[PDB]
Design a protein around this ligand. Structure first.
Ligand SMILES: CCCCCCCCCCCCO[C@@H]1O[C@H](CO)[C@@H](O[C@H]2O[C@H](CO)[C@@H](O)[C@H](O)[C@H]2O)[C@H](O)[C@H]1O
Ligand SMILES: *[C@@H]1O[C@H](CO)[C@@H](O)[C@H](O)[C@H]1NC(C)=O
Lengths: 166, 79
């Protein structure tokens, strides 16, 4: 159980697999081993880092609209970082041509930062109008996202793990 | 760069711990400024004193906490 490099052996099983073929009926024995991976490793290496990145993308909402250099830099760097993070992860996953679960969880974080960087663009656009009402709408969008994104991520978080906890 | 040279394994290595730690200490550092900027925007004189206080703490808090982890880490993996 310890000897295995990348998997952990949970179970063993001796069954029969005697079948009937075109040539005849041949007796057959099948021994079976069950390998599952340590969630612990993959949690620290892949998931936790990106959780920190998504959280970082949120703190631009708590900055005012006027600080353009603050929220631009936060938004674009977080996205650059996520692309690098995704790059480091992608270049160690075993080559496969179907969507893995981690691959879903990567594209999600990629979206939540794309939307975070997008949210500021909306706020900056409507805040340029001199009317006081647009300003109250500009400020409102921020206050919403301050608690909207953490909810939506937490919703996805629930959906994701429930889908892939089987 | 580090992760892409470690031999493939699926259990938490010691270096992997120490990487995630530094990743956290910088995440918290970038987070500390966000707190300072948030409370400093308030025009009240008291909040300014707290904003300055948070900085002065972190100036010596982080080096302590890292040194604490430093002690904990090596002692755990010095066997
Ligand atoms: O909660 C935690 O969820 C993960 C994944 O479901 C489990 O992790 C383990 O169990 C499940 C089986 O049910 C496997 O899919 C997973 O590969 C294995 O590492 C932990 O045992 C459990 O403590
Ligand atoms: C392990 O195999 C035994 C024997 O068939 C079975 O009873 C048990 O359900 C299996 N455990 C798991 C992990 O499903």
């Amino acid at each position: 159980s310890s000897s295995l490099p990348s998997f952990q052996l949970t179970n063993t099983s001796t069954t029969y697999c005697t079948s009937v073929t075109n040539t005849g009926i041949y007796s057959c024995l099948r021994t079976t081993i069950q390998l599952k991976r340590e969630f612990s490793f993959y949690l620290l290496q892949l998931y936790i880092p990106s959780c920190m990145l998504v959280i970082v993308s949120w703190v631009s909402f708590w900055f005012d609209r006027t600080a353009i250099p603050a929220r631009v830099t936060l938004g674009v760097t977080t996205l650059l970082t996520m692309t690098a993070q995704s790059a480091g992860i992608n270049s160690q996953l075993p080559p496969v041509s179907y969507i893995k679960a981690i691959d879903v969880w990567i594209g999600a974080c990629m979206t939540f930062i794309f939307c975070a960087l997008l949210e500021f663009a909306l706020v900056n656009h409507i805040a340029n109008a001199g009317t006081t009402e647009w300003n109250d709408i500009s400020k409102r969008v921020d206050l919403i996202s301050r608690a909207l994104f953490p909810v939506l991520f937490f919703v996805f978080n629930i959906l994701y793990w429930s889908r892939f906890g089987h």
